Paper text:
Therefore, a crystal structure of full-length [name] is required for a better understanding of the function of this enzyme and elucidation of the binding mechanism of [name] inhibitors. Here, we determined the crystal structure of the full-length Ms-[name] at 2.4 Å resolution. While the published [name] structure in complex with CSA contains two macromolecules in the asymmetric unit (ASU), all structures solved in this work only possess one macromolecule per ASU despite crystalizing in two different space groups. At the same time, the α-helix containing residues P88–R95 is disordered in our apo structure, while it is fully structured in the CSA-bound structure. Detailed analysis of these two structures showed that CSA binding induces a shift of the T46-H52 loop region towards the active site, whereby the side chain of Y48 is flipped inwards into the binding pocket. This concerted conformational change avoids the steric clash between the side chain of Y48 in the apo structure and the ordered positioning of the P88–R95 containing α-helix upon CSA binding. Additionally, the full-length crystal structures of ligand-free and compound-bound [name] provide the first glimpse of how this sulfonamide scaffold induces a number of conformational changes in the protein upon binding in the catalytic site.
Author numbering: 1 to 87, 96 to 412
The structure:
Amino acid sequence: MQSWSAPAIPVVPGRGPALRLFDSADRQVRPVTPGPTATMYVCGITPYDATHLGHAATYLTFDLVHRLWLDAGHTVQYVQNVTDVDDDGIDWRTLGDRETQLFREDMAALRVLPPHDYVAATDAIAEVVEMVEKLLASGAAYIVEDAEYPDVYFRADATAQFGYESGYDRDTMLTLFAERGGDPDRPGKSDQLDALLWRAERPGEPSWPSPFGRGRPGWHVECSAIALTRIGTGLDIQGGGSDLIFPHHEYSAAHAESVTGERRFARHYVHTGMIGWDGHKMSKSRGNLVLVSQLRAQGVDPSAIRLGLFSGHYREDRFWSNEVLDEANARLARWRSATALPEAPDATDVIARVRQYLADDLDTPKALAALDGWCTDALSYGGHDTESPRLVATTVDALLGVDL
Ligand SMILES: [Ca+2]
Ligand SMILES: [Zn+2]
């Protein structure tokens, strides 16, 4: 499926430390040690809702991972999905296709590297059916005892390690399950936390054939199946927003560990903070939705959006504000001024520190502040290095995606 166009990626000479990331499971910062090809599955967007700045912040976070892996010479397999299953006046495809296209233009304008496999959830029905078949034949799944709606459910206890990815207690799991798409009170389930794998065909819903009856795939098995068939057991990073910690990434990992037998679906679970506005979460109800195309219409440099979001650590829940935008504009204007000078101070140390800072769990505040300091040195004192203004500009392009 079509994603978006990639920008030119300049080559930064030299090399920096290997990337280390916070793992949500272990709750600690550990090395990311991929093979020659580095693998990444980030959960995509839902076209039936508005894609806002918090969502963009997530894909920008994994853009840095992608760019840092490219800087270290890895070839990358970036896989991303689109949750076009479940959730009007005009058909659900019409207004749904438009949100996906606007997402492409928002990603392209932000110079986000596109995934190598953009897999719609409707183009992966067979892969899901394959995994459910394996899960049923091993006893990990069952068919609920219902006459008209023989739903297929994944046993919460199919994996001994269930709950390792989120750390949540069972009550917290039950409370989140109800509010994030689960059906803890569906009759016939052996355990409240059992996860739907195949929803039985209901009258009025589109359906797909399968050996266990017609219906639709479950949310978590969609992602589990796409990642398994496109990347396999050697998945370096499972990524997404923090709301996906439970249930989504717990069950999606449990499904895959059940079929493959491996202890860990992904070597790293990497979760981003949310981006709110005025002390409030962003949603269509509150009318506080801060969109990327809204800012672009208002004449906001996309690079300024990146720097605004990078001014905070990717794991911090934080808030967008006009003060944040103003500081990003001032920073962008100052970085552009210094990198335009014909000569500047040597940039070897700051580029080294930037690479170290980004390797240290994507410490973009330290990276931004270190670049601020060199720019201020360049503009206050000058220098005799005729290459460092361009060297810093291309470093900022390749590693941060910012176009000066
Ligand atoms: Ca290199
Ligand atoms: Zn997902």
